[PDB]
């Protein structure tokens, strides 16, 4: 149900494999291969921990294990999807597509979140606690923006782009440092003066965010999907299918493992868990082999 965030996150993750027409990360094919391997090691550990703590009934350790497995599965899928894309575009008939310098939706979410938080801490009807929590929100999304700018500069070879992205990021970080400072003063002594000062301090941050927005909007910095040929599509299918099956069986493993955690004495569920684990292993092996066989440059 809506409760099972791990299962829902596996489903969300599967979307990466549905049509790899754009690069999802900055990994080379070598990077993808390394990632797959590392995440294999980590996933094995996790799956062992899941069984063990389901038997022993160690619910907190079990939960940590599910969280670990989930992370590894995310990492696997990102690597597999990226690898798929790289295999596709590498086909002679395929024309490559530009990686987006920033995620525009995630950017807009940061903008709106920062905005709401500033507006909150600006209010008269706002407790000391609420100002702090508002600040953690501002901080969360602000750092997200700066990090995205850092990546954007690394990605782009454009001279004005690299400079301005890093510059805008610096403005955001600076003015956020100024905001968090006056909020710390306000936390030291909660008074009208300090609250009005805080309402001022948001102006340069909002301006900085707005500037960065205008700059990032430029269609030169946006992503363009790849023209992937039927041959390229055929080449990447085994990787995609292996990755999908891996996710199916992993979801099955988690789902069954919860039931076993609440009721360990059930041989059928244990047999189902085993089957899921084995299909996961076989999917990972078939994925690795598929990535080797279809490795670009051949």
């Amino acid at each position: 149900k809506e409760c099972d965030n791990a299962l829902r996150q596996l489903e969300t993750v599967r979307e990466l494999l549905e049509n790899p027409v754009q690069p999802i990360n900055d990994m080379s094919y070598f990077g993808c291969l390394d990632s797959v391997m590392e995440n294999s090691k980590v996933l094995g550990e996790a799956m062992t921990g899941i069984s063990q703590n389901a038997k022993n009934g160690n619910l907190p350790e079990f939960g940590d294990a599910i969280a670990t497995a989930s992370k590894a599965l995310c990492g696997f899928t990102e690597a597999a999807a990226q690898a798929a894309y790289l295999v596709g575009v590498s086909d002679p008939n395929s024309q490559a597509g530009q990686q987006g310098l920033v995620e525009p939706t995630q950017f807009a979410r940061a903008n709106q979140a920062i905005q709401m938080a500033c507006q909150s801490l600006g209010e008269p009807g706002c407790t000391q606690a609420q100002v702090l929590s508002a600040a953690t929100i501002v901080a969360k999304h602000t750092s997200a923006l700066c990090n995205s700018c850092r990546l954007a500069s690394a990605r782009t070879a454009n001279p004005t782009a690299k400079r301005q992205f890093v510059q805008s990021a610096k403005e955001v970080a600076n003015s956020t440092a100024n905001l968090v400072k006056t909020i710390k003063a306000l936390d030291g002594d909660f008074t009208e003066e300090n609250r009005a000062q805080c309402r001022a301090a948001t102006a340069p941050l909002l301006e900085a965010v707005d500037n960065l927005s205008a700059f990032a909007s430029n269609p030169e910095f946006s992503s363009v999907p790849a023209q992937i040929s039927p041959e390229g599509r055929a080449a990447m299918e085994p990787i995609v299918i292996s990755a999908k099956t891996m996710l199916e069986s992993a979801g099955g493993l988690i789902q069954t493992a919860r039931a076993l955690a609440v009721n360990p004495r059930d041989p059928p569920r244990w047999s189902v868990l085993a089957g899921h684990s084995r299909t996961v292993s076989d999917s990972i092996k078939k994925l690795i082999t598929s990535m080797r066989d279809k490795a670009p440059g051949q």
């Binding site: 600040a135 953690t136 750092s143 990021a169 956020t176 968090v180």
Partner: peptide, 25 residues
Amino acid sequence: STKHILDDISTMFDALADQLDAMLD
């Protein structure tokens, strides 16, 4: 250590602003 959340935020952003400053020029 048990540090103040605001202290941690300020530290993070000063550090990041320095890093960005240095990254280009």
